[PDB]
Design a protein around this ligand. Structure first.
Ligand SMILES: [Cl-]
Ligand SMILES: [Cl-]
Length: 162
């Protein structure tokens, strides 16, 4: 089990523009296209992202190419972030994956905002961090995915995905 497999379980694979839990135009492996109601604004973003005229449809390889870019961007955003970097440096490899999961899903800015949890992660206060992370919109909107991520953070094991 690794971050790629973990995220592919959490996000799925879809070759046709679709909407996410929030209502946004998404595609492939959790790749947010636009927060704009326009399906045409989505298709335009998508063709731009892919470099071709897609008509809102891509191949598995294209979704994988996007996924690879997004994981890389997630990792790099963590490492370039003053609030995020220290937490990550302090964690073991499983837990690191958890933070990358969150960052991919909610953005760097989003996660960086979880002030108290971040402080608990660093202090290696696992239970408390798990409890505090559950007190969020994230958790209330996508409870099963969130529980999985929270268990990973709390335990340092990959059970939830097994
Ligand atoms: Cl892109
Ligand atoms: Cl869910």
């Amino acid at each position: 089990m690794n971050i790629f497999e973990m995220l592919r379980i959490d996000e799925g694979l879809r070759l046709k523009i679709y909407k996410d839990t929030e209502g946004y135009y998404t595609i492939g492996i959790g790749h947010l296209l636009t927060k704009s109601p326009s399906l045409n604004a989505a298709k335009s973003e998508l063709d731009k992202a892919i470099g071709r005229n897609t008509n809102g449809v891509i191949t598995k390889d294209e979704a994988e190419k996007l996924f690879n870019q997004d994981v890389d961007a997630a990792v790099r955003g963590i490492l370039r972030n003053a609030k995020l970097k220290p937490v990550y440096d302090s964690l073991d490899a499983v837990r690191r994956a958890a933070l990358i999961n969150m960052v991919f899903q909610m953005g760097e800015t989003g996660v960086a905002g979880f002030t108290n949890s971040l402080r608990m992660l660093q202090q290696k206060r696992w239970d408390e961090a798990a409890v505090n992370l559950a007190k969020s919109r994230w958790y209330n909107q996508t409870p099963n995915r969130a529980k999985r991520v929270i268990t990973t953070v709390r335990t340092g094991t990959w059970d939830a995905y097994k």
